[PDB]
Design a protein around this ligand. Structure first.
Ligand SMILES: [Cl-]
Ligand SMILES: [Cl-]
Ligand SMILES: [Mg+2]
Ligand SMILES: [Mg+2]
Ligand SMILES: [Mg+2]
Ligand SMILES: [Mg+2]
Ligand SMILES: [Mg+2]
Ligand SMILES: [Mg+2]
Ligand SMILES: [Mg+2]
Ligand SMILES: [Mg+2]
Ligand SMILES: [Mg+2]
Ligand SMILES: [Mg+2]
Ligand SMILES: [Mg+2]
Ligand SMILES: [Mg+2]
Ligand SMILES: [Mg+2]
Ligand SMILES: [Mg+2]
Ligand SMILES: [Mg+2]
Ligand SMILES: [Mg+2]
Ligand SMILES: [Mg+2]
Ligand SMILES: [Mg+2]
Ligand SMILES: [Mg+2]
Ligand SMILES: [Mg+2]
Ligand code: NA
Ligand code: NA
Ligand code: NA
Ligand code: NA
Ligand code: NA
Ligand code: NA
Ligand code: NA
Ligand code: NA
Ligand code: NA
Ligand code: NA
Ligand code: NA
Ligand code: NA
Lengths: 81, 46, 56, 143, 82
RNA sequence: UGUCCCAACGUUGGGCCCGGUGAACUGUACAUUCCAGUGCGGAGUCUGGAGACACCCAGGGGGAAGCGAAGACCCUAUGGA
RNA sequence: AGGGAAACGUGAUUCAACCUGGGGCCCAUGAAAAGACGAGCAUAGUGUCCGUACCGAGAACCGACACAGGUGUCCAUGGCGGCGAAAGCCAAGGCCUGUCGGGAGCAACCAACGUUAGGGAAUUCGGCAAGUUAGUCCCGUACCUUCGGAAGAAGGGAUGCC
RNA sequence: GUCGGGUGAGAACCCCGACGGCCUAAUGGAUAAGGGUUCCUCAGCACUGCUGAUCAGCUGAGGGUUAGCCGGUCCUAAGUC
RNA sequence: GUGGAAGUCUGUUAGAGUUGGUGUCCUACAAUACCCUCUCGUGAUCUAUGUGUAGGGGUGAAAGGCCCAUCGAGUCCGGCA
RNA sequence: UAUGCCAGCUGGUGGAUUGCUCGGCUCAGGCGCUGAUGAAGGACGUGCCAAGCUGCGAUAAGCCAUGGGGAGCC
């Protein structure tokens, strides 16, 4: 069985979203919906996912831009990995 | 033109297959990518 | 108008595409039939004996 | 140095055509180092980057001509290029005329000067193109 | 340094729609000769250029008074309008 | 009315010289030819004479029955359509 | 709210878009289905999936080429001009990439082209090529005719500016 | 196009400024199809670029496309399975 | 006078077409191009996209025209040495 | 004695020749069915770095058991 989350998509633009918008970007399996991406994320990092935007990339993978609630801090969640 | 998720996957593979043989392989093999495809000079399938 | 060069300009139509069944770029997307494996016309795969010399 | 990228940037930030963005010839180096839009705005605020002014066509000579023509000149046979019915649409002009005449008759009736029988008579005559203009009509009205 | 009148009558030997360019060359060739310098060392202030290109690429004035100066360690001339 | 008598001058791009780039056609061999002759009767190459110091640049194309195409004409084939 | 350095207008004419009518034509009659309305209101929750870069062309497409060819839609209301979505000139916007340059008053020759006295089709298969005429208004207009037309017949005059 | 200048081992053609021009149903703006990463950034010049190149649609590596209310999706057309 | 009909007229509006130059080109920019000239331009009009007809068969306002540079019988492979 | 002719010498261009064979061609013996318990084939994936080939299949150049084998291996 396939896993929802593949790995954190870390790039300059990903950083800006994390520092400035409290958003975490991930490389997720392309068969995963926004909702699945949401759950998986909350469960894996114990946070509150507010919104998820997806985009099927020219790399063959799906990218997910996940925004965490003001309650959580992306910068911190990402720093532990 | 409007491409589908499947198409996009293929074009994607092709782009990747369009990278060069890494330097390290040259050494590991004591010594060419015969599948180099230019977007203008070559034509993909479909 | 010349049937040559000047008539080559209008060719921006898509027909034969990558066949889901045999992987060749011969699936005629208007016909929904593959010119190579027959996918969309025959359950059995396309094959003829004239594809090779009679005695081989 | 190559400031082409910046040019496209300045033009979007200044919100102007690339061809109107000016770069101070003495600050290429500094402008060269500009890499982010913000860096641009900054050089903009320092006046190192500015936008040339766009011109408009002067309508002066146009207005002089417009006056002479509104006053009746520069319209001689040697100044006309289109057919006559081209310079003035005959159908349009009849609508212009017949409406004026129908409005006139309309007032005189409500005004009392005309009985709805005299009015009728004149209206029907106007619609038959009996009056060249309102003036002509009034004239005819007076016997 | 001195003030010189450059004749541009020879710019007519070149096709009319390109008089400017030729003039501009003639100007450089003149100085180089009259100030015994290499055409490489002759610098023409933009004033001179705008003068030659005043009425377009095809209408160049027949003469042009130009002010030049000569000097330095390799030899050169710098010039301008007047 | 430059179609012509009857051509001239001018304009622009070429052409010519220089830097850079850089093909193709074609090639049995030999080859400075010319006048004649001869030869399968339409010869730079045979025979006799004449002429001819070598190389190079530009030209308009007389000749190489110039290059290009196993003649469409014509006939033949116990050919094709 | 926003935006602007600032002022952060008021009226008018002509009026694309959009809206709403009337007339006329057919030996031509100008889709269908989903859906919407009919059928209220509050609060809350949900709204997944695929496309989204860029070119869109005298270098991103088809034509073996960074090919003078071919290739659909929308912007048809930018100014003068004028009948005009025409010419010509000019904005906004774009460009100097229809991408090799330097030099000779720059010869012969060639390609495009201007002007040629007198004659005026003698040229040539043939006026081929080139030229003449020209916009607008007024006068005026033959043979013939299927009465519609011929007709812008032809011919004559005018034409700017203040 | 020209004169200055910038960068660079190297500059006629890479960049800045001025002067001079070109395009006005297009040489502008938005797009369909088609292309398929050509888009952006950095690093380069052995290939490609009708010369050169410090430039590039080239070479290499990285990065980039975020939708309840734009499209698809749904409906039915000629017609197709 | 009104009205505004027309396989109507002028017309490089857009667009479509292609008469002459027997120009330019003719190892092209191009295996049908460039320029000037010329025709149609409210209709038997032009056009995009979708869709139907297939090889002794289509399609043809008929030229033996056209059916992907292929046509008095497409193209591919086989019969085939 | 320029331009140049013939032959050679040195160097080059070219890749013939000779030598070599991880490939073919042919004959011979043995063996011989797979698939809805989803085959064959294809697509896309899968490696620390991985473009091609091979292998493999989200357990992805691999996991387990038994036997062999052996100090090497990836
Ligand atoms: Cl009405
Ligand atoms: Cl869309
Ligand atoms: Mg999306
Ligand atoms: Mg890439
Ligand atoms: Mg054909
Ligand atoms: Mg009328
Ligand atoms: Mg002799
Ligand atoms: Mg023969
Ligand atoms: Mg015959
Ligand atoms: Mg027969
Ligand atoms: Mg976009
Ligand atoms: Mg080009
Ligand atoms: Mg004369
Ligand atoms: Mg005669
Ligand atoms: Mg004669
Ligand atoms: Mg003529
Ligand atoms: Mg770029
Ligand atoms: Mg760079
Ligand atoms: Mg008509
Ligand atoms: Mg017409
Ligand atoms: Mg069609
Ligand atoms: Mg016949
Ligand atoms: Na990844
Ligand atoms: Na391509
Ligand atoms: Na002449
Ligand atoms: Na000759
Ligand atoms: Na106007
Ligand atoms: Na250049
Ligand atoms: Na009437
Ligand atoms: Na023509
Ligand atoms: Na047949
Ligand atoms: Na055969
Ligand atoms: Na077997
Ligand atoms: Na590999």
């Amino acid at each position: 069985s396939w896993d929802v989350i593949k790995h954190p998509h870390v790039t300059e633009k990903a950083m800006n979203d994390m520092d400035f918008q409290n958003k975490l970007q991930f490389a997720v399996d392309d068969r995963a919906s926004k909702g699945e991406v949401a759950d998986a994320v909350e469960e894996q990092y114990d946070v509150t996912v507010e919104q998820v935007n997806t985009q099927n990339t020219m790399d063959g993978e799906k990218k997910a831009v996940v925004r965490l609630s003001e309650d959580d801090d992306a910068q911190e969640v990402a720093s532990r990995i | 033109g409007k491409k589908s998720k499947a198409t996009k996957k293929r074009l994607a593979k092709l782009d990747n297959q369009n990278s060069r043989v890494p330097a390290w392989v040259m050494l590991k093999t004591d010594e060419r990518n015969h599948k180099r495809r230019h977007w203008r000079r070559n034509d993909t399938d479909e | 108008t010349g049937a040559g060069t000047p008539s080559q300009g209008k060719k921006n139509t898509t027909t034969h595409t990558k066949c889901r069944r045999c992987g060749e770029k011969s699936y005629h997307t208007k016909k929904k039939v593959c010119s190579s494996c027959g996918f969309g016309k025959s359950a059995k795969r396309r094959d003829y004996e004239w594809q090779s010399k009679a005695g081989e | 140095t190559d400031l082409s990228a910046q040019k496209r940037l300045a033009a979007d930030v200044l919100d102007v055509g690339k061809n109107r963005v000016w770069f101070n010839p003495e600050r290429q180096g500094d402008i060269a180092d500009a890499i982010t839009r913000e860096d641009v705005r900054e050089l903009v605020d320092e006046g190192a980057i500015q936008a040339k002014d766009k011109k408009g066509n002067s309508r002066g000579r146009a207005r002089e001509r417009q006056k002479k023509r509104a006053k009746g000149h520069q319209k001689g046979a040697g100044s006309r290029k289109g057919k006559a019915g081209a310079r003035q649409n005959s159908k349009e002009d009849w609508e212009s005329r017949i409406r004026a005449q129908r409005t006139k008759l309309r007032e005189l009736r409500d005004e009392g000067t005309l009985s709805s029988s005299q009015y009728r008579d004149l209206y029907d005559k106007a619609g038959g193109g009996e009056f060249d203009s309102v003036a002509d009509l009034e004239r005819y009205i007076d016997a | 340094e001195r003030v010189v009148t450059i004749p541009l009558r020879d710019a007519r030997a070149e096709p009319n729609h390109k008089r400017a360019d030729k003039a501009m060359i003639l100007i450089r060739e003149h100085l180089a000769k009259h100030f015994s310098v290499d055409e490489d060392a002759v610098r023409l202030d933009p004033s001179i250029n705008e003068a030659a290109w005043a009425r377009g690429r095809a209408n160049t004035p027949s003469k042009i008074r130009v002010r030049a100066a000569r000097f330095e360690e390799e030899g050169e001339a710098i010039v301008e309008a007047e």
